[PDB]
Amino acid sequence: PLGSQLVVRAKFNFQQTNEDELSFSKGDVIHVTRVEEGGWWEGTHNGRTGWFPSNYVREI
């Protein structure tokens, strides 16, 4: 559970590949909540929480 206040911006549109993943549109800002090796981070956006590809975002 990330303690710092990391925010990222989506570089692409992402359709969740699983129910536990975050769908989002290019330009959306995501608040990172978990960061695990493997390329998938967990995050929040508009009250929704889930995993997403870390290579789809740019740290703000």
* Residue ranges that bind Hg ion, judged by CB under 5 A: 39, 45-46, 48
**Choice from 28, 33, 35, 49 touching Cl ion (CB under 5 A):** 28
Please state the length of the chain: 60
By CB under 5 A, residue 24 contacts Cl ion? yes
Give the contacts of 43 (CB within 8 A, at least 6 positions apart): 8, 22, 30, 31, 32, 33, 34, 49, 50, 51, 52
* Residue nearest Hg ion (C-beta atom): 45
Number of chain residues interacting with Cl ion (CB under 5 A) = 3
Q: How far is the CB of 9 from Cl ion (least distance, A)?
A: 9
